[PDB]
Amino acid sequence: SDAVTIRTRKVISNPLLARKQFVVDVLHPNRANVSKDELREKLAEVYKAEKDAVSVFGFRTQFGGGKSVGFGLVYNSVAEAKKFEPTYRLVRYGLAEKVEKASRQQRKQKKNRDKKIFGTGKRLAKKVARRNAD
Amino acid sequence: EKTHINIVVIGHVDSGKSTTTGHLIYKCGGIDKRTIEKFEKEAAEMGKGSFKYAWVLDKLKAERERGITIDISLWKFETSKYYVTIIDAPGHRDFIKNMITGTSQADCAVLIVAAGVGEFEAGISKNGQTREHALLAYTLGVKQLIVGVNKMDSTEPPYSQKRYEEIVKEVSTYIKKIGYNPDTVAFVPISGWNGDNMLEPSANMPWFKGWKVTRKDGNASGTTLLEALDCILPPTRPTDKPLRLPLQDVYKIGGIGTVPVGRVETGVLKPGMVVTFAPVNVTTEVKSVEMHHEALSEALPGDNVGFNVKNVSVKDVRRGNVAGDSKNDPPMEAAGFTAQVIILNHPGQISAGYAPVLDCHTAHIACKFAELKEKIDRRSGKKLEDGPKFLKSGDAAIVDMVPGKPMCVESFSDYPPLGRFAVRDMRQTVAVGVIKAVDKK
Amino acid sequence: ARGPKKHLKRLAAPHHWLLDKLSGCYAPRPSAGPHKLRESLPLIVFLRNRLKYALNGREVKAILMQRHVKVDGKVRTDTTYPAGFMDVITLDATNENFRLVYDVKGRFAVHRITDEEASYKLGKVKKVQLGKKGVPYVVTHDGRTIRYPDPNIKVNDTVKIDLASGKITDFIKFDAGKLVYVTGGRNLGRIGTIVHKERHDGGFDLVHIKDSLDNTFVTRLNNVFVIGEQGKPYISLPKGKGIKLSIAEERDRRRAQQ
Amino acid sequence: PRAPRTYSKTYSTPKRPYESSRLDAELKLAGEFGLKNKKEIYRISFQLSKIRRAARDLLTRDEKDPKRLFEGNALIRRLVRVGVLSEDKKKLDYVLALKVEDFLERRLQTQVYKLGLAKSVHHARVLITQRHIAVGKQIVNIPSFMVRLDSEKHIDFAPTSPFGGARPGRVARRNAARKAEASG
RNA sequence: GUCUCCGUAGUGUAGCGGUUAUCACGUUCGCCUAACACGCGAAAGGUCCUCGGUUCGAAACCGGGCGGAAACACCA
RNA sequence: AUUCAUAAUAACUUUUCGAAUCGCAUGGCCUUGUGCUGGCGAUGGUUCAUUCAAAUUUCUGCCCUAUCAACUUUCGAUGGUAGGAUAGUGGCCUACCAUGGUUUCAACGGGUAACGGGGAAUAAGGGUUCGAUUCCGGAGAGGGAGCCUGAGAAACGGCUACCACAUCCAAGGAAGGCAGCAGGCGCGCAAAUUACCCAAUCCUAAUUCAGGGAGGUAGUGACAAUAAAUAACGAUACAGGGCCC
RNA sequence: UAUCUGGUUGAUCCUGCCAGUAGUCAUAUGCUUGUCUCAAAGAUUAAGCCAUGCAUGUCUAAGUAUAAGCAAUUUAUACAGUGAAACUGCGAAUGGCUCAUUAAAUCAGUUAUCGUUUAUUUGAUAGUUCCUUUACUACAUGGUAUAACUGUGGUAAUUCUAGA
Numbered sequence A: 001s002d003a004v005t006i007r008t009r010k011v012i013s014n015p016l017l018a019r020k021q022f023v024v025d026v027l028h029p030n031r032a033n034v035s036k037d038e039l040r041e042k043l044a045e046v047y048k049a050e051k052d053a054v055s056v057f058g059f060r061t062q063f064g065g066g067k068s069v070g071f072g073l074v075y076n077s078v079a080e081a082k083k084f085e086p087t088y089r090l091v092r093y094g095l096a097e098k099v100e101k102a103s104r105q106q107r108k109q110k111k112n113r114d115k116k117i118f119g120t121g122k123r124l125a126k127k128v129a130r131r132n133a134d
Numbered sequence B: 001e002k003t004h005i006n007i008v009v010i011g012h013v014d015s016g017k018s019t020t021t022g023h024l025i026y027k028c029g030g031i032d033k034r035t036i037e038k039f040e041k042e043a044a045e046m047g048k049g050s051f052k053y054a055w056v057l058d059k060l061k062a063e064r065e066r067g068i069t070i071d072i073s074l075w076k077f078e079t080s081k082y083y084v085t086i087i088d089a090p091g092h093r094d095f096i097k098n099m100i101t102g103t104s105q106a107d108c109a110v111l112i113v114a115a116g117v118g119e120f121e122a123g124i125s126k127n128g129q130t131r132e133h134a135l136l137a138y139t140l141g142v143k144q145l146i147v148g149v150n151k152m153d154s155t156e157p158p159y160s161q162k163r164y165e166e167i168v169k170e171v172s173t174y175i176k177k178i179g180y181n182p183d184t185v186a187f188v189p190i191s192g193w194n195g196d197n198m199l200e201p202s203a204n205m206p207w208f209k210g211w212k213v214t215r216k217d218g219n220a221s222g223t224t225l226l227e228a229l230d231c232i233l234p235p236t237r238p239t240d241k242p243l244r245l246p247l248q249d250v251y252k253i254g255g256i257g258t259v260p261v262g263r264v265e266t267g268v269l270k271p272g273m274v275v276t277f278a279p280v281n282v283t284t285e286v287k288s289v290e291m292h293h294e295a296l297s298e299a300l301p302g303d304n305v306g307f308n309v310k311n312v313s314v315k316d317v318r319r320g321n322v323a324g325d326s327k328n329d330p331p332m333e334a335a336g337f338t339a340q341v342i343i344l345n346h347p348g349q350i351s352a353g354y355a356p357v358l359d360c361h362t363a364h365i366a367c368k369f370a371e372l373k374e375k376i377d378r379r380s381g382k383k384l385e386d387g388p389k390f391l392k393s394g395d396a397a398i399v400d401m402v403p404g405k406p407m408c409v410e411s412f413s414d415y416p417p418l419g420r421f422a423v424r425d426m427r428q429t430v431a432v433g434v435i436k437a438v439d440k441k
Numbered sequence C: 001a002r003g004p005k006k007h008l009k010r011l012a013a014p015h016h017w018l019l020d021k022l023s024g025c026y027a028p029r030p031s032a033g034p035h036k037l038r039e040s041l042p043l044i045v046f047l048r049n050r051l052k053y054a055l056n057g058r059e060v061k062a063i064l065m066q067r068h069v070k071v072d073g074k075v076r077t078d079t080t081y082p083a084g085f086m087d088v089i090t091l092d093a094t095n096e097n098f099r100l101v102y103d104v105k106g107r108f109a110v111h112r113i114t115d116e117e118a119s120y121k122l123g124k125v126k127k128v129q130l131g132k133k134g135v136p137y138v139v140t141h142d143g144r145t146i147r148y149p150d151p152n153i154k155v156n157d158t159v160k161i162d163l164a165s166g167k168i169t170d171f172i173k174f175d176a177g178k179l180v181y182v183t184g185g186r187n188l189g190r191i192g193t194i195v196h197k198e199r200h201d202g203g204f205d206l207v208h209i210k211d212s213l214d215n216t217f218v219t220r221l222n223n224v225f226v227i228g229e230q231g232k233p234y235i236s237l238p239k240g241k242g243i244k245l246s247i248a249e250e251r252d253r254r255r256a257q258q
Numbered sequence D: 001p002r003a004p005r006t007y008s009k010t011y012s013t014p015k016r017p018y019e020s021s022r023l024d025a026e027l028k029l030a031g032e033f034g035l036k037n038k039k040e041i042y043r044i045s046f047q048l049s050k051i052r053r054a055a056r057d058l059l060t061r062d063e064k065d066p067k068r069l070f071e072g073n074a075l076i077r078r079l080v081r082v083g084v085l086s087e088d089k090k091k092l093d094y095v096l097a098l099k100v101e102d103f104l105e106r107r108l109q110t111q112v113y114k115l116g117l118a119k120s121v122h123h124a125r126v127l128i129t130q131r132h133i134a135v136g137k138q139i140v141n142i143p144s145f146m147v148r149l150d151s152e153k154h155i156d157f158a159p160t161s162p163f164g165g166a167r168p169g170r171v172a173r174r175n176a177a178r179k180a181e182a183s184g
Numbered sequence E: 001g002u003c004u005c006c007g008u009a010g011u012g013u014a015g016c017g018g019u020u021a022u023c024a025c026g027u028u029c030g031c032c033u034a035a036c037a038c039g040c041g042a043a044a045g046g047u048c049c050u051c052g053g054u055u056c057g058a059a060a061c062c063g064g065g066c067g068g069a070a071a072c073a074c075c076a
Numbered sequence F: 001a002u003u004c005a006u007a008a009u010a011a012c013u014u015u016u017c018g019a020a021u022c023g024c025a026u027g028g029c030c031u032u033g034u035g036c037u038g039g040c041g042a043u044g045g046u047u048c049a050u051u052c053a054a055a056u057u058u059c060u061g062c063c064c065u066a067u068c069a070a071c072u073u074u075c076g077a078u079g080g081u082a083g084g085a086u087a088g089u090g091g092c093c094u095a096c097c098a099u100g101g102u103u104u105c106a107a108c109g110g111g112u113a114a115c116g117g118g119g120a121a122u123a124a125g126g127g128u129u130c131g132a133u134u135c136c137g138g139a140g141a142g143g144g145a146g147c148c149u150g151a152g153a154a155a156c157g158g159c160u161a162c163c164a165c166a167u168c169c170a171a172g173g174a175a176g177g178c179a180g181c182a183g184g185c186g187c188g189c190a191a192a193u194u195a196c197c198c199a200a201u202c203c204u205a206a207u208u209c210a211g212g213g214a215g216g217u218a219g220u221g222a223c224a225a226u227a228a229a230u231a232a233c234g235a236u237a238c239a240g241g242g243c244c245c
Numbered sequence G: 001u002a003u004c005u006g007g008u009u010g011a012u013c014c015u016g017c018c019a020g021u022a023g024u025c026a027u028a029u030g031c032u033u034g035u036c037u038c039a040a041a042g043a044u045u046a047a048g049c050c051a052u053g054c055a056u057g058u059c060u061a062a063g064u065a066u067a068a069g070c071a072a073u074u075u076a077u078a079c080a081g082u083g084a085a086a087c088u089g090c091g092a093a094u095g096g097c098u099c100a101u102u103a104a105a106u107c108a109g110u111u112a113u114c115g116u117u118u119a120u121u122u123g124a125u126a127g128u129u130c131c132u133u134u135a136c137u138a139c140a141u142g143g144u145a146u147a148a149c150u151g152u153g154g155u156a157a158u159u160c161u162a163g164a
Helices: A036-046 A078-084 A087-093 A104-115 A122-131 B017-027 B033-046 B061-066 B096-104 B119-123 B130-140 B161-178 B225-230 C043-050 C057-065 C247-255 D020-033 D039-059 D066-082 D100-105 D108-115 D121-129 D170-183
Strands: A007-014 A019-026 A054-061 A068-075 B003-011 B074-078 B082-087 B108-114 B146-150 B186-189 B249-252 B258-261 B274-277 B282-286 B334-341 B365-376 B383-386 B396-403 B420-425 B428-440 C069-071 C087-091 C096-100 C121-130 C136-140 C145-147 C158-161 C168-172 C178-181 C191-198 C206-210 C216-220 C226-229 D133-135 D155-157
Touching (some): A019 A036, A036 A054, A036 A068, B003 B017, B017 B074, B017 B225, B130 B161, B130 B428, B146 B161, B186 B225, B334 B365, C043 C057, C136 C158, C191 C216, C247 D066, D020 D039, D020 D100, D108 D155
Parallel strands (some): B003 B108, B108 B146
Antiparallel strands (some): A019 A068, B074 B082, B249 B258, B334 B428, B365 B396, C069 C087, C121 C158, C158 C168, C178 C191, C178 C226, C191 C206, D133 D155
């Protein structure tokens, strides 16, 4: 939080992926860590971009305290960020919402149950209902 | 949504307990027609055609051959108001301990009384069980009950009111002496074998206007037995207390480990929970829980739930233990305990070293009275004498007693269902009491 | 076992891929293609661990699906395409053309070539036969089939494939005084000149290739690749040019660089 | 099916575990250098045996041998780097003449004592394990660090330590707050 | 879990509702040596498994509990 | 090194292939018309080569036993001829003919608390023991046999039959092979949760999107390994080691 | 880190064995147990038997739709957007588990296929198929169902199936 001094290293350029990769070295003297939103904010103006155009992960704090090493990415456009950044990091900051597809267990059971019927099942449902009405 | 209650059933031999129970289960969606028709065929080959309804609960070979309910048996049926399961009591002085095990895990009670000429007089006699079974119900914690006058077609003339009114008058005089208010108790005339006045109103007996009850909570007035089962009050379930479920049975189920089964007297049992059985001292984890072939997440108090243990064995586990959460205060072995007991007539005198088969909850064991502390008044715990020399019938007393065999017990203040007990000696109920203090091991 | 195998555990993969042994238990098995699986390089490992352009497996898939790389003129879309020796990957973006040439140490390299050099690819022919309808053809090391070749072209020579048109434009005969490139074996990646050879008409022809520093070594004829005459390489040689310095000379080179 | 990790034992138990002469020797060494477990002496002897075995295998080969020369100087360079061998003893024969005390002297515990910041080797151990001492710009809490004649000038109090300035500390605050409130 | 056959000194194990004792081994005790040893000369050793009654009176008459010795059972 | 690749003759086919498939952008010539030409692709297709492979095969090498010294050939054993079958060579099989083939240089038969190897423990050297177990090559889906589909199976999380097991039965009948991931009984000295995710490493499909108990993560875990708390530092009461008076 | 010791005898020197000693990716068990990293784990006896729940299905710009499914075409009169199910084309013979059988057998190093098959890929590769081949025939193009679906259903049950 004090004297963050975000220094970037190993900067590279990828017109292939429309992104620039760099191992971001951040020092946090007398402070524990720097929050992910913190480095992303000042990552915008050093690369002359916006907040919602950068991506950083890692940040394993060096033993003893006062240093942290992480790897960061910057994307040129919002649409480029959507089409390249993975969904887990998208929902992470503010970029999208993770919809709960129930869980793996019920989906597998539903798939097997749907596999046990040959067709839509509307005729099967009405046939079993008529036969088992009594 | 529908609540859940638990009933037990009681009565004299050949009063029509299992016939009334089984046929009531059949009417309320228990079993389909081909199952009971099979039972009619097999019992006709045996020779006991009348017992086809009794066979539904009496499943054992020795029970069906003899035509005798030896051990208790469970069976469910959904009434109009809520869920309920029955305890089929033996109704014998031979198997009186099995009745005490069944009635101890029951909230309400259905006192079946014979109406036929001669059988009622034999039932309510010195040797009969109608006096005993009603007394044993109030002893173990069955506060509310229902009386059912059975075999109305058997008596001569058939469906005679004078006979019904005579039985209700005779029971009302005795049942007041036990503790039950006969105003609050419902008296229903029925026929178990015929299937009369149980589900629907009877055509054979229009004279019967209707039973009625006068409680503090709410009044009820029904025509049939089924409506009287709906009018039973929801009991007070102590969910907040530490678990104190004395086990009922321990099965080794196919493809799902060891499965301990028992009613949650107190607390909430659930899957993935370590438990400790009290006398044997065996710690183990439960795999899963069930109640009448249906799985459960939360086993609430007063339920026929059944956990399943794991990482151990069926012999380490046993009928009688208390799965007090190995995390919460578990049930410990009792070396000696302060358990007052009042007596209900011991032909012999009660002094010391006398080990009757203390049947606290579901467990029966001989207990020797180390000594007698104080002769106490019949009520309010009033101290009358210091250090008595002997005790007689019709007298209360605090007594410290050492079990002859490892037993688990607990105080009445902590656990009301656990604290109840009776005493038996010379094939008769000599005393009845409650435990206030207990020394752990 | 009851058919082919489509898997590669991350312990039987070729060691020149420079793959680790902790990131997963499997390896990117190359699909069937021009080169063998043990003598080529999948596009996934080349872009993820060599160029470091892509981090994860899906990033390589996204780059490949976006029609960016061009291997031997063809764009290609398979993540496990077996790109081996004499394979040129052209990237329209970043303005770099990459050529797969072995290094002195025994792995692949990231040698950068000009756009003119990427227009032609050298190829060592393996078989010359008279095919159906009487048409002659040659079989290069990459498996390319070129019809109606030069009659002077025989077995164990090298041709200059035009790549863009797929036509032979120049052929280099195999004789003494020819700069070659060893492909495969414990002596792979060495560049030297041929002095003589013992024919040994029982298989496994041997050729005595001599380095520019008077170092001589023996390599089977199946592992050689003529890349030009003496002193003039038809291809831009990688850095070092296969000097093959010893462990002592390498250590002094490091101490003279730090 | 992942590749298994490699593990190795770094100590060798003595063949004769029951001998007064050897028993007193390690007790003297452990007490002088401030060591709790004699496995630490077992460990440091195990490393000595390995390098002696490697150096012995080198001495059975002729001079101007590419294998003997390359590994010989590499082992010699490592030893003189870590400071167990002096500059004038780089001849591959004194390597066989190394003792346990020479290796033990290079431990960070002894160097902290030698530079004069602990006043006792046992106080060096508590200083090591309480994170009051750092190497360069990194806090090290391992007693065995084996400084290599280049970080010896970088041994100093950590910036995040009460002894070397910084925030006063835990028990001091409780005492300071107690006396401040008592006087207030 | 239900049903059946037995329970008796220390090992053996008799024996028999008005009352439990015997028998060998053993268990000790005086005997000698130095400790012995054999040789010897004498006597210490059971709520009749537990409780409850029947009982003038029971361990044995009866029933309950336990122990052991045998069975059949025991899908939340 | 070929009766090799290949070409041409005379025929054989009941006849193989030689595009009736699909998506975008829709452009030019004029004899001004649903006239005539025209791109970037996907799918499929006969043959060759290549690649991922598959199946045979040359040489050498495996534990203990002679209280196993002869083995094989009835009814296949050795070799030859010719033919069937195979995707191919071949007693693989068949018909005929010859009587061969192996063996103290350890055949054959028996036991194996015997899958083999890369390797592991142990030590100066030599060597001994172990190796089911993360990788490679093999066998099996309870014990055998048979077969369809497909390039590839003699497949069992594919079927057919028998035997030993075993489930649902309103007694006619139907449905199964956990030595897959968890979990249950039994066995024993002896060995874990009936959890989460395709986020990584990969594989498969028409394919960037989907699926994968392959796999990864967490939980139980003192199988084995690495480092390392449980204590240190001043002042006072005694007891010292050089030395000053 | 190329090391020994105790025990036959009144005592000595030997042979000789027993015991001691240290290690084990050799297990099992006992007592105790505070921390970080890494991590084996139903093989040994039973390749003994399994309740239950999962473990392989799959599409693009581009095989087939009028879902009597969902939004809007308004660039589209035949759809041409998204798209369940089904047909079709592939995969399901990979992976995973176990070590029962097996002692020139498997397997390891090393050769051959001039003695064979080879999906999928990669690079190439069909001016010649109207057969009295002039009416014998659509080639700005042929024929036939069938699934899904609509409705009738049967059996107690099955990933059971019929008729229209």
